[PDB]
Write a protein that binds this ligand. Sequence first.
Ligand SMILES: [Ca+2]
Lengths: 556, 556, 556
Amino acid sequence: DQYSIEADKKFKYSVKLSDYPTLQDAASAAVDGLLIDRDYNFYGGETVDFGGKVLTIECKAKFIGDGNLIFTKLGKGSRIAGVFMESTTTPWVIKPWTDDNQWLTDAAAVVATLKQSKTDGYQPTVSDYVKFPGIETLLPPNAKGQNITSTLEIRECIGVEVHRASGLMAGFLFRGCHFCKMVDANNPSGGKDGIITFENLSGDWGKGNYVIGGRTSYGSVSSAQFLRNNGGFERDGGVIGFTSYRAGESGVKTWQGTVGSTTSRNYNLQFRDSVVIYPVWDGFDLGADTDMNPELDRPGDYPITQYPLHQLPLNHLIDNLLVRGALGVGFGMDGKGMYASNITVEDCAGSGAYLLTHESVFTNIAIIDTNTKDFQANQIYISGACRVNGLRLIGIRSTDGQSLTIDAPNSTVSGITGMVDPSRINVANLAEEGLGNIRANSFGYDSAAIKLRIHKLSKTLDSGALYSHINGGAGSGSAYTQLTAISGSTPDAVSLKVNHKDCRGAEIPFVPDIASDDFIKDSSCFLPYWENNSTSLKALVKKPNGELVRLTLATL
Amino acid sequence: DQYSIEADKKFKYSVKLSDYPTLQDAASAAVDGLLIDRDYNFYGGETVDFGGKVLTIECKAKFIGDGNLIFTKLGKGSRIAGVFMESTTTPWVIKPWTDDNQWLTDAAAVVATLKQSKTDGYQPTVSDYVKFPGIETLLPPNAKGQNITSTLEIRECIGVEVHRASGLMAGFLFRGCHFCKMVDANNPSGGKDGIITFENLSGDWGKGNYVIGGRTSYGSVSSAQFLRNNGGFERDGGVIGFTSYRAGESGVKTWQGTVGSTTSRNYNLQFRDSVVIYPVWDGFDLGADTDMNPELDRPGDYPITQYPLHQLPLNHLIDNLLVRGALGVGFGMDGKGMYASNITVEDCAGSGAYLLTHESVFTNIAIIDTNTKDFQANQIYISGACRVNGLRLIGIRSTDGQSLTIDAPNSTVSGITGMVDPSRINVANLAEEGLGNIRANSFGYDSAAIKLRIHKLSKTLDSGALYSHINGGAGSGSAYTQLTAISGSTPDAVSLKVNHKDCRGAEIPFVPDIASDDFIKDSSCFLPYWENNSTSLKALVKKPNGELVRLTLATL
Amino acid sequence: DQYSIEADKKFKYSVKLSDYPTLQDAASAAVDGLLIDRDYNFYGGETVDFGGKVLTIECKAKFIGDGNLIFTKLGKGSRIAGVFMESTTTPWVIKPWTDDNQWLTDAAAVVATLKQSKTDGYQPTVSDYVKFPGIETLLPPNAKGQNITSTLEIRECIGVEVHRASGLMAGFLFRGCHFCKMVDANNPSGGKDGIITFENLSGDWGKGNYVIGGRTSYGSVSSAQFLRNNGGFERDGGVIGFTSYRAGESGVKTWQGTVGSTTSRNYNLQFRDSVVIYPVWDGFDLGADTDMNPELDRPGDYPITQYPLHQLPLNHLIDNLLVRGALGVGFGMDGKGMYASNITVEDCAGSGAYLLTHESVFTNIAIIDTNTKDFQANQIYISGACRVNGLRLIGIRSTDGQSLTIDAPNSTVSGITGMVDPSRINVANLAEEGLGNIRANSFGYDSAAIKLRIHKLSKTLDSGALYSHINGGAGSGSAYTQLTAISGSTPDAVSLKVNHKDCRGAEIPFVPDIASDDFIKDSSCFLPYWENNSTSLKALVKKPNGELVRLTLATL
Ligand SMILES: [Ca+2]
């Protein structure tokens, strides 16, 4: 009896699943630790009551089952580590990319990829019918409407963290939770449902809910997603340090519109220091209102009368995000009064950025080789009256067609860099107000150029230029400077030159016939013109007093 | 007796606080693990001696008390996880922001926010008397001079990590420690003192001390702070991956000046990959010398004779920092020979950056909508002779008054982007030395412009321009080019035109009266001028040999 | 007997090394936990078989020994925390930097630093003979050819993580492993071999192998390195959130060429959000093919016939990297079709970037004060036909010699910022195609300038300019505009002026002698020239019909 007293005081308490017939039996026995040391086959909806205990759940085996294993009544501070979810069903999956990692877009080609596997692809859903037009008709019935996910559901808990989770056809659902985290996800391979979901459609708005670190792969829909979460002014929630690969829909998604009877939208979350690669749809989908065929109202949210569609004060903190390889859109937002910074998007088949934003500011944005499949009208679209400060455009891809690169018709932009085709820029105002003394350095040409283009006049033709051109060859120490203007849609049609052929003189264009009175603009100026009938140059003079006189300028 | 031998070998050792009357009793019994499984009321200054043992302290309950719970003699490698500090006192707190997250600046409005709470605000301190002028007189006595914090103090330990700490009116103090870390702080709500402090005023300079990950909220003073730490050339210390919200003073602070009898300054620390949002004072305060009313000496540090005020070789590694919503200054530094890179500051009421630096380099800085309340003279200030390479200025806010945007009078700057008002730029030298061939693309105007402004002549008026202007309307295929110069403070007063009204000729300005000899600059050039008494143009000619002659140029 | 049944169910299982004579004995007894609670002296090659068990190994003492402690047959999900490796030998180390952190380059000075220590320096290797020319002759024999490392070797394991490792003369080797991680390395001080190595020369290509977080210091060779790893399209491996200090070779290295009988190269890895400071060689060395004296083949990899040298489809994900203080090259790559973004390199003695890349894209690169010791021909070199979009050049250092800043002769570049000497730019094409309306703001001069330089003509002299110059002094409200051209290698030799001396007229240069027919370029233009024998200006006129006529323009 004496040893048992000492033993009870000196040893760490932990129960292990190998000692119990059911997970509930183990949960009931647990006091401090719970070890999952044997695989456990659960039935869909199997529910475990943890009695409000603050438990440290250490997983060293699998939870096996289609459907949801539901954890309830875990005490604040509970931790679940190393969990591995696996379905019983091996579904039919598609793999819409090649052995060289080229996206497949042809429906028949995608159908040909069908195999039964728990990974290396995903179960088709109805969004695939849109993504791969014609695939709905071509998919065999056994590959349509599948619904396989093995989901760990944390239900109505506060202060629970799931660490280093993994699995096959695996999902993680936090339903009605607060102050919960999915930490260092160990590359679970997804199933039919979202891989990581914070859903708060009932009860209080979700808060304190984060994805921190880790990564996921595959899944039929989005990798990390939020419904009805509001981080407060404290920005207590969101996604930080996360990587998503090959989402069947999007890497990171804040839901839009009405789900069930209420709002699925999200406010005041962080989206930072994260990476989304090769999503079938979008990299980051951070809008709150429905784009196509929107609801006319927002039950449970601000009414349309207060904030028009796409003008919600979402107020997310969005910074240092990278996207590569989207088959859809790299980076999507809506809202009014938004800020986003340090966003880099590369090699996307649809728009790099699709921004349904108004009175918003975008700082240091890089959109590099996007809309490569011409899925959208442009590489970056901005609907409302926004500011862009720093915009890198164009990597190494050319564009064969007529699509715009940036269409931001109400936006004021500064600091574009890259080999953009200037005819493919459309903005409200473009300006470099604060440059210093400037030098234009020309390589691979016999001239250097400072060109002007008035887009109201022509988007495709420069209206005037300042050139410097080599006289002779390399090392001559001689160039001529040229000031030009467009006429008859012919760039550089009319020009004044300084030092052509090293002559040390100015070559001055004159009106080729009798100049009309209205040709001269300013007082105390003269305009030379040709009088062919005498082989003479004349001068139309507007005198200092503004009155016109015609003089003889040069004679035989 | 046989079972006890086997049991002692096969089970993990842990003691738990529920088995002991005092925390010291539990600490003394511990060998490997220590579980805090009941709330523990501690008295201020209660000191626990852990006997040099390498302990894994797992907290699943609260430490409750005003004042400091002092942990001593923990072995290297000890870990404390999940600690939760809470005060016994519920103090009076102010909440100087509105339900729309607008800062309150009026003292009377701030006083009206007073409530008794352990969170959602902070206890006033003497710095509030400066921040909210007049508040000292208006605060009730019971809201002044409060001193409530529940602090975990790790004293004179090496290699101790505190993980996932939280609390209410909570603080964490590492006093005289080395190689200690505050890891993944779980959003403790702060009290009167700094939330996370590495203080090494006695003993060896602090080294190896980090804040890694996590976040904090509220507190009366700074969220994370350092005194007398030196990371060495190895840069072994600092703040990485951290978020601070609503510091009563600053998000991250390296102390300045003398504290007690010695230096509180810091060297060779990292400040990287971190975020500070809504501090009442500053985002990052990384200076070492006192700005206002500085000490005349530096006991315990380099003397003023070796390094003048603000010119210490602090040598921090500063990169990838974000600040939004400061009521004070976003980003502050001093030092000589400093580097900072990839700093983004948005929506601050005081200066975005206040840099008391000399011979320092700033790369890729973005200061976006700051000094919004005109608290300072500018949005970014630099005192000494520094280099800025990449500077984004202006989001969507206008400035109504006369404040400068950048005042860096000794600095050389390149790569400004944004809709800056050029009259609000003051630098030593501004240049784009390495641009390629250039095109100026104009949207929303009937002209395109390349302007020149000589700030010595005028900060507010362009001194000359190269324009292209539409002739006719859109699609005309015709424009005129114009070269202009300022006269009588009237921009574009004098100009030469090419192709005005599609005339295909150059319109040339002439001197409106008899030209003085000194009007002509160069040899082998001529200057037309008006002789009104004969209705003639004359030419003042400087011949190739440099001698002047006056010729008749155009006649009736 | 009843208590033993209950005890076996309610307590956590862990064995501890203090109860066993050998580590294998402890490993054999272990079921769940294993505690290292006494220092353990191991012999080189001592091999522990963990029986496929999923073990949680908690280290609170040292593994002491020169050579490798080899862990085998650990179950997937096994974790080793807090491990501390230490050599038995205290070797001779060099410390090639001063007490002011200046690099020592002189061999004799480096030899003078020799001391016996397990840290604060490194054991010389053969690469030091190249790095410090002449040192091979000057090093005492007892400091050459040393081979001290205490290495934890994880051999042929899947799903094993080493967390918070540290040590002295310490190394960590994952040999033939997959899905293994080195997490939050706690600043181990390195020995002779790489500090963290994933080597997969035998068996399947390495995959799922990461360095996540943490830091290392010293070591004779590279801090983190990979051999024959391929992360797949999923990019499942690499280095994220890591810091390397004072690598004896490089911070992060993907091996090049043949090692043994097969390829050591790597594909599809992540290199992100990491920092390398003060490497003796390079910051990030991410090439796959050997630069100097390359192999003529690639056994085990793509043949040269498929992909030429330096043109492998390595396809790494490279983003948000910082390097400071390299004695060699900051950032090195090779490959074809590569992308890298958001790379910042400061204060390197060799090139900031050395890029043996083709058809690759570099976005937002900052190379700030590099090649400071003229070790290479330039600060950034690019061999093949690449695109650079955003390139910051020059901090505060000057260059005294003739070295180029960027030499990227086949590359097209846009968006250079900084005080680069334009004569030190060499690229295929440099352009700013998409700027808006422009203003050149001049500070510290009596003029503002927009210059043109045709590098084919001269790399050192501007070929033409548009100036604005003050007339009178500050506040005069008057300037003159000047359009210039180079002649006889004299910049600004020939010019047209508008408003010189506030005269309100254009000063027009004329040919100083009789103009040749070929001097005039365009029809409907005239060229003034001097007839000295009559003191007359003439006009060489190209009439609207293209025929030449000579007229009298101005007469006495
Ligand atoms: Ca005449």
